[PDB]
Write a protein that binds this ligand. Structure first.
Ligand SMILES: O=C(Cc1cc(-c2ccc3c(-c4nc5ccccc5[nH]4)n[nH]c3c2)n[nH]1)Nc1cccc(F)c1
Length: 234
């Protein structure tokens, strides 16, 4: 199947900065998202094949792709409920049942990814999307980076989960700092603290995910079978 622009109706922008559009496949009338990347803008600053070997309930599906002279087009699952980031601003912070449920969906997604030995880098709330039943979907830079990626993998996803849980429950990442260099010091020396409201089970989990020595971070199964997790997700 060789797709083209003329195959889809186009509506409003959804994304921004390296351009995704609401779209509709003209014949079946199916709503989806079209990412229009600029080749030139990439002869500047594959892998769409790793993405097409993937099928998971919490990874954004890639339905196909095409290109013309200047542009590469990705035909993507449209997440009707928007970004987790949007929801965090709307909600301020998430409850534990909601947080734990997102952590489980992430960690499932990440098992499967590691199982097809795909390893994602840093997950940020803006890269997390929300399906029609509000199930999560996966799709400066500092705040999410682990020590390894800043100082002098597969455990870097444990760290990401850990920043995320923290961000979900408190409404802020744990290393937010007045400056790029302060954040570097905080992350790099693992300097963060919890507001008093964060419960014991959540500290234990986040505490374990956020050790500086990777090989002391839990395994994905341990996150999945974590008592705070298995207690709180639906
Ligand atoms: O290149 C990008 C960046 C990117 C942006 C998006 C993106 C952005 C927004 C949406 C949306 C979407 N739904 C919304 C509803 C309300 C407001 C905004 C929304 N964005 N659905 N699917 C999306 C997908 N995905 N990926 N991802 C990518 C690349 C290759 C393979 C792959 F699986 C993902």
């Amino acid at each position: 199947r060789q797709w083209a622009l003329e195959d889809f109706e186009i509506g409003r922008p959804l994304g921004k900065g390296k351009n995704v559009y609401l779209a509709r496949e003209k014949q079946s009338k199916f709503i989806l998202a079209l990412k229009v990347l600029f080749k030139a803008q990439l002869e500047k600053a594959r892998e769409v094949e790793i993405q097409s070997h993937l099928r998971h309930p919490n990874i954004l599906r890639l339905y196909g792709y095409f290109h013309d002279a200047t542009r590469v087009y990705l035909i993507l699952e449209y997440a009707p409920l928007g970004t987790v980031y949007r929801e965090l601003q709307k909600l301020s912070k998430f409850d534990e049942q909601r947080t734990a449920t997102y952590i489980t969906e992430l960690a499932n997604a990440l098992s499967y990814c590691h199982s097809k030995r795909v390893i994602h880098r840093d997950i940020k709330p803006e890269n997390l999307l929300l399906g029609s039943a509000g199930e999560l979907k996966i799709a400066g830079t500092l705040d999410y980076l682990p020590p390894e990626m800043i100082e002098g993998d597969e455990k870097v996803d444990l760290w990401s989960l850990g920043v995320l849980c923290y961000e979900f429950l408190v409404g802020k990442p744990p290393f937010e700092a007045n400056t790029y260099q302060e954040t570097y010091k905080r992350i790099s020396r693992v300097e963060f603290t919890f507001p008093d409201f964060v419960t014991e089970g959540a500290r234990d989990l986040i505490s374990r995910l956020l050790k500086h020595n990777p090989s002391q971070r839990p395994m994905l199964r341990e996150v999945l079978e974590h008592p705070w997790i298995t207690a709180n997700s639906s």
